[PDB]
Design a protein around this ligand. Structure first.
Ligand SMILES: Cc1cc2nc3c(=O)[nH]c(=O)nc-3n(C[C@H](O)[C@H](O)[C@H](O)COP(=O)(O)OP(=O)(O)OC[C@H]3O[C@@H](n4cnc5c(N)ncnc54)[C@H](O)[C@@H]3O)c2cc1C
Length: 449
């Protein structure tokens, strides 16, 4: 149990009641440093550990697709935790008000939460800190190397972050100890009432049939493990060669599970390290799930304006500014982008993959966001549109990887300058013709009519 994974958010007077783990980002019972640390603190204090989860007022900003995925996962989690004699409490409302009251009502001794660098989590932490008198800790349960340890600053490139992270893997890549058992309404009801509130905004085909197909990704810890196991057995050997081909299903498909914390990336890395596969494919995959994922936490943690133009590198701000008044080839509205009504069939197909499955292939996500910049009035408007659509329709959205990936695509964050073009300046350009040279674009379009 490495103390560098835990940080104090508030010093206080420890009460004599249970240790409370305010679960938010890491919705799993296994392989969860925040839960393991909470259990250990409870044991030292001779008290039980309890889990509290807040169903917040912002769920109406996304869709049924994410709400059902998350809640079905929590139904399974409640059962798993209760098998370890760990009670779970699901609070409906504002974390500031609901967690503060719970701590007081239940005489909590200590409060622990998991780590997210997103602004909304910081908003909740501020409100909770001002309403409690007990000690408050946060644990990085999402990254292999704690975010505040991997680097002390924003890293401008994968190649500056990569040796810092790999230097620390020997310390922080380790097996998990087993979770020791201990010595306010039904989730089915919350899901029903929330779905009924979301129904008017469900994405529909003109037929009135819903667009979303829920059968592509089954939610929960158990299903996540099966996805990991099948990736290692069936897809890892080809990952290096085929990861950029959206006509093949050769990615891990782990991002929805990783986003909600239904599986630990440290677990995935342990299992991939011990698998014998193509060394090139293993290297490629580890670069994505270690370097690119954890540098996205680095980006959001050290850049308070991670969702704005101000966080782009200076070379990219200067270049995009120099091309602000260039005439754009096309300008689409939010609603035209949302419905896949551009002139570009590959763009529209990528949007239909997103609408129907909730998970756009990683290669076309790059293409998709870069064309929003090309066909938007300004870089700021492009950022707003890409974030809006990514977060509304991706199962893995509302995530540091989403803000960092959009910033990479539109603002060159973690990229370098390329040849200068009109409108997009020196931001890496991705052409339709260049995609045709790299995969069977007609097959991807035919699949997503
Ligand atoms: C415009 C844009 C928006 C994106 N939005 C999100 C998002 O909202 N949520 C999200 O989790 N990822 C996002 N990404 C990153 C990436 O596209 C997805 O993580 C990946 O496609 C998920 O599919 P997978 O798990 O099957 O991928 P695999 O290729 O199997 O990768 C394994 C994991 O590595 C990580 N990873 C892979 N590529 C990236 C990357 N470019 N940046 C950061 N981490 C990466 C992810 O954790 C991923 O699950 C975005 C990328 C772009 C260009």
């Amino acid at each position: 149990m490495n103390p560098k994974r835990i940080r104090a958010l508030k010093s206080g007077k420890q009460g004599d009641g249970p240790v409370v783990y305010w679960m938010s980002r890491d919705q799993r019972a296994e392989d969860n440093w925040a839960l393991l640390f909470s259990r250990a603190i409870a044991k030292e204090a001779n008290v039980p550990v309890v889990v509290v989860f807040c169903l917040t007022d912002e769920f109406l900003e996304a869709g049924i697709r994410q709400y059902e995925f998350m809640l079905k996962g929590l139904q399974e989690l409640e059962v798993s935790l209760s098998r370890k004699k760990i009670p779970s409490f699901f609070l409906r409302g504002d974390p500031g008000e609901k967690i503060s009251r719970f701590v007081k009502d239940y005489n909590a001794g200590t409060l622990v939460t998991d780590f997210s660098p997103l602004r909304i989590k910081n908003q909740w932490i501020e409100k909770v800190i001002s309403g409690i008198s007990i000690p408050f800790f946060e644990v990085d349960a999402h990254n292999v190397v704690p975010c505040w340890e991997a680097s002390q600053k924003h890293e401008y490139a994968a190649h500056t972050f990569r040796p810092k992270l790999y230097a620390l893997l020997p310390e922080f890549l380790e097996e998990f100890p087993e979770l020791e058992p201990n010595s306010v309404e039904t989730l089915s009801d919350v899901l029903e009432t929330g779905v009924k509130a979301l129904l008017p905004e469900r994405a529909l085909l003109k037929n009135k049939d819903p667009l979303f197909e829920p059968w592509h990704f089954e939610p929960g810890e158990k299903a996540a493990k099966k996805v990991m196991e099948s990736f290692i057995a069936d897809r890892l050997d080809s990952y290096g060669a085929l990861r950029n081909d959206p006509t093949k299903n050769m990615l891990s498909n782990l991002s929805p599970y990783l986003h909600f914390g239904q599986i630990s990336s440290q677990r995935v890395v342990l299992e991939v390290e011990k698998a014998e596969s193509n060394p090139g494919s293993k290297k490629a995959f580890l670069d994505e799930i270690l370097i690119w994922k954890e540098i996205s936490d680095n980006f959001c943690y050290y850049n308070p304006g991670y969702d704005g133009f101000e966080s782009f590198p200076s070379w990219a701000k200067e270049s995009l500014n120099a091309h602000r008044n260039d005439v754009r080839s096309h300008i689409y509205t939010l609603e035209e982008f949302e419905a896949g009504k551009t002139h570009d069939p590959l763009w529209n197909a990528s949007q239909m993959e997103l609408l129907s499955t909730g998970k756009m292939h990683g290669y076309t996500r790059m293409y998709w966001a870069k064309k929003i910049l090309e066909w938007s009035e300004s870089p700021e408007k492009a950022l707003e549109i890409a974030i809006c659509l990514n977060d509304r329709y991706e199962l893995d959205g509302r995530d540091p990887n989403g803000y960092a990936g959009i910033a990479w695509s539109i603002g060159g964050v973690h990229d370098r300058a390329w040849g200068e073009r009109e409108v997009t300046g020196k931001i890496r350009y991705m052409s339709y013709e260049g995609c045709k040279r790299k995969f069977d674009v007609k097959l991807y379009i035919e699949k997503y009519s």
